[PDB]
């Protein structure tokens, strides 16, 4: 299959958070069955980032989602053509973040090019002050809609001080696939845990890894629901 | 200890939903430490009500709660003082359900008391036509905030047609406790899954019952983290 037990990935992401332009590019790799994958990111345009790099961390993977329990998968059956993900985040704070991605395979290689735009954020909260502190675990929603997946999360983002930011988005994946035999899932969810192994120069240089399984809820239900 | 391995409940629910004024009560039992528990709600003022029930759903019990390893619990300890919890919830197409609940232990029986308001629910919308198929099940999301504890909640109504209608809600949590030695958690979450066992007379009756269990993330980490 062209999704193989272990996968590379390369990536391109421009934009811009409160009219600052930027640019970074990163390459990983990881096990897509596993739902694990690690990659080195670096900040080649714009660097050091007035901002923090926490913003940009979900925006740098879905073809590595561990599915069990049979969930069809929405990202490796999308192969060759690839898919997009597009999505909205908005901070409790005013901030809001939002991108479009475009994900393809070449040579064997998963090839991602995000487009992303944050707009107001505070000039005196954590992101613009760069007192964030990486991002807790979170379970993403999930359901067929608008002709692809959309999915929702909520997230929280630790703080100087050891209190929390939070933030919720809306994201729509879309197949670039049009396969009669492609199988849509149906409501479930992918519980996601995104942690920074790394960083030097003043964030240029970053190291993030994710873990992901698609799943349904496990709790035991009176009317046999899954 | 004051909340034992069985109790029971009485709810009284009193407001509107696009300002159509009802009122409901109930009486339920379960296990705390189980977190499992089950009411029976009758619509005993404005009933049949020209809103689906669901809407209500998780208005009528954060005591029945199961707690393993590692996260305090706010609300058992809370007792015999009781606690508060204020939420407000936002459905996709406009509708809004704020809600002010008061929770307290009097004889032996947990006592609750929700004042609601619904505003705003589009006229041709699932809930004002009453083609709701009950929630799915979710993740809440809690960490300290506000002197209490805050929790965030995304939740899916399965519609007639199978679709969803999606909504959210902010909910603070505040212990009417003042104790040195009150533990408070840190962030976690608690999973849910809240089904409707029985109905009649157009929802002027109706069992609901709920599984719910304090837990973190499920996935491992790469830095030890919780």
Same mark, same amino acid.
């Given at each position: 299959?062209?999704? #193989? $037990?272990?996968?590379?990935?390369? &990536?391109?992401?421009?934009?811009?958070?409160?009219?600052?332009?930027?640019?970074? @590019?990163?390459?990983?790799?990881?096990? %897509?069955?596993?739902?694990?994958?690690?990659?080195?990111?670096?900040?080649?345009?714009?660097?050091? =980032?007035?901002?923090?790099?926490?913003?940009?961390?979900?925006?740098?993977?879905?073809?590595?989602?561990?599915? @069990?329990?049979?969930?069809?998968?929405?990202? !490796?059956?999308?192969?060759? $053509?690839?898919?997009?993900? /597009? *999505?909205?985040?908005?901070?409790?704070?005013?901030?809001?973040?939002?991108?479009?991605?475009?994900?393809?395979? /070449?040579?064997?290689?998963?090839?991602?090019?995000?487009?992303?735009?944050?707009?107001?954020? %505070?000039?005196?909260?954590?992101?613009?002050?760069?007192?964030?502190?990486?991002? /807790?675990?979170?379970?993403?929603?999930?359901?067929?809609?608008?002709?692809?997946?959309?999915?929702?999360?909520?997230?929280?983002?630790?703080? +100087?001080?050891?209190?929390?930011?939070?933030?919720?988005?809306?994201?729509?994946? *879309?197949? !670039?696939? @049009?396969?009669?035999?492609?199988?849509?899932?149906?409501?479930?969810?992918? +519980?996601?845990?995104? /942690?920074?192994? $790394?960083?030097?120069?003043?964030?240029?240089?970053? &190291?993030?890894?994710?873990?992901?399984?698609? #799943?349904?809820?496990?709790?035991?239900?009176? =009317?046999?629901? =899954?």
């Amino acid at each position: 299959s062209l999704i #193989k $037990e272990n996968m590379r990935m390369m &990536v391109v992401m421009e934009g811009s958070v409160n009219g600052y332009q930027f640019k970074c @590019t990163g390459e990983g790799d990881g096990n %897509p069955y596993m739902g694990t994958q690690t990659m080195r990111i670096k900040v080649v345009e714009g660097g050091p =980032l007035p901002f923090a790099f926490d913003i940009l961390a979900t925006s740098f993977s879905k073809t590595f989602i561990k599915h @069990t329990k049979g969930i069809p998968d929405f990202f !490796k059956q999308s192969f060759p $053509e690839g898919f997009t993900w /597009e *999505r909205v985040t908005r901070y409790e704070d005013g901030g809001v973040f939002t991108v479009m991605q475009d994900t393809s395979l /070449e040579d064997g290689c998963l090839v991602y090019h995000a487009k992303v735009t944050g707009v107001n954020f %505070p000039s005196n909260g954590a992101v613009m002050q760069k007192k964030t502190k990486g991002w /807790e675990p979170s379970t993403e929603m999930l359901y067929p809609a608008d002709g692809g997946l959309r999915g929702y999360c909520q997230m929280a983002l630790n703080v +100087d001080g050891g209190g929390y930011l939070f933030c919720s988005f809306e994201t729509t994946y *879309r197949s !670039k696939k @049009t396969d009669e035999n492609f199988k849509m899932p149906g409501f479930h969810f992918v +519980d996601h845990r995104l /942690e920074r192994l $790394e960083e030097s120069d003043k964030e240029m240089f970053v &190291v993030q890894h994710e873990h992901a399984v698609a #799943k349904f809820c496990d709790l035991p239900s009176k =009317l046999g629901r =899954l």
